[PDB]
Amino acid sequence: SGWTFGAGPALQIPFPMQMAYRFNGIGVTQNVLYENQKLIANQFNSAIG
């Protein structure tokens, strides 16, 4: 759900779109995430590992 589960009813939303939301919230455009999605995913997986 993202952040809506803590401010009211839960709303379903794809996780890449939630990541685009969180990237646009800090000033970075959503295109860098919508294009380089595989790189961000691999970096996140490597960090989690």
């Binding site: 890449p16 919508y34 294009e35 380089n36 999605q37």
Partner: peptide, 19 residues
């Protein structure tokens, strides 16, 4: 490069006014 994009058409606020 975008994964999950669909084909559609967008509107232009200049084409109908000019044509």
């Amino acid at each position: 490069v975008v994964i999950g994009i669909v084909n559609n058409t967008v509107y232009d606020p200049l084409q109908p006014e000019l044509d």
